[PDB]
């Protein structure tokens, strides 16, 4: 087998491959996740609308299990690999423990996988960062982030990919108990947050929501258009 150290320490103690993979994440399409009391929202920026793409195939917001969902930035193929591995872990965990997987558990599994690739022989880092949203058994909303490094944190709201720093500053300013209160307000908040980063606006975003004891639901294009028009009304 190809046994080689792709990742190694450098002078000043930085893992250059991990940093470069985070740079690769930065290039990717924006994603934004906003935790909410009875809802958790995920949004993602369509890199471009080819006008020939089938919208179904290109979706970046995927259900790891019925109770948990994720969105990603970075290399889409690597994202698909980790998504499938997390799905099989979800099913195996359910098999072994006779209970649904918690968001912390699946986040830890994805993080351990990414960290293994950062330290194992002959494997590059997974060039992705993921926003993992789900509802715990109690119904507590959960939002976590993962990085190529393997570190994982919980965020009340966070963004990944291109424009992540700017939109993160924006929702740092704009996050409040008032916006979290209404599910429509959470959706409008994330739509605004994305609207800064995406120049085209309107149909250039993909948005999804999950509610307590509900499956992942992707809003219709006309529905997000209605929300976007609502934002236009709010400005005046």
């Amino acid at each position: 087998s190809y046994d080689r150290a792709i990742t190694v320490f450098s002078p000043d103690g930085h893992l250059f491959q991990v940093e470069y993979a985070q740079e690769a994440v930065k290039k990717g399409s924006t994603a934004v996740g906003v935790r909410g009391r009875d809802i958790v929202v995920l949004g993602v920026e369509k890199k471009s609308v080819a006008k020939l793409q089938d919208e179904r195939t290109v979706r970046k917001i995927c259900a790891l299990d019925d109770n948990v969902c994720m969105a990603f930035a970075g290399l889409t193929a690597d994202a698909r690999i980790v998504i499938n591995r997390a799905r099989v872990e979800c099913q195996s965990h359910r098999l072994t423990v006779e209970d649904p997987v918690t968001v912390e558990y699946i986040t830890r599994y994805i993080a351990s996988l990414k960290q293994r690739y950062t330290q194992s022989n002959g494997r590059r880092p997974f060039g992705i960062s993921a926003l993992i949203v789900g509802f715990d058994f109690d119904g507590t909303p959960r939002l976590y982030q993962t990085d190529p490094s393997g570190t994982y944190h919980a965020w009340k709201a966070n963004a990944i990919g291109r424009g992540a720093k700017s939109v993160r500053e924006f929702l740092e300013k704009n996050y409040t108990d008032e916006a979290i209160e209404t599910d429509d307000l959470t959706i409008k908040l994330v739509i605004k947050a994305l609207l800064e980063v995406v120049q085209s606006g309107g149909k250039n975003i993909e948005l999804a929501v999950m509610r307590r004891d509900q499956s992942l639901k992707i809003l219709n294009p006309e529905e997000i258009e209605k929300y976007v028009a609502e934002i236009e009304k709010e400005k005046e």
Partner: protein
Amino acid sequence: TTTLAFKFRHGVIVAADSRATAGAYIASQTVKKVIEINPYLLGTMAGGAADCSFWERLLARQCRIYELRNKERISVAAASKLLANMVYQYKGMGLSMGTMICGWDKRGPGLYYVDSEGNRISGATFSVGSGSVYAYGVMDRGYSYDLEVEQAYDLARRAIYQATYRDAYSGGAVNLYHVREDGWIRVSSDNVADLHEKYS
């Protein structure tokens, strides 16, 4: 052996004899068949004592590792499934094991019966052992979900006593355990001789 466990409104009772035998010879009359797997759930022994002890101790360490990793105590159902999956690997290799994994969780009081054959089942009343057949009848007549804690203690103690009276390979002292939401408590250990004085 005779072991007994049932669920009632104020938790789960677990009872067992203290006799261990090799053929006819009674090797020990003071074995602690109820195994304290951890502070929050506990198990019983029937069949091979070595098999039960070893596999339940392995379950104990796995449960503690799960607690440390997930920062929450394992559910009784999940622990029963860990034990079942563990023993199924060695199916057909001579393991003789009978276990009743008893505890609380978010569900409520939980009682699961696990076997070397592979059965894992939840039930309000279970009894596994040589004298389980005798214990079952008295337990069934007495048992109700609405039962006082003292009444349940009496039912379990007398059930194990009658099973010891009829069955040759069950005897010694009736250890009794009560699971409460905080955790298990070792309520009594009565010798069947003084119980024979009491009941008769």
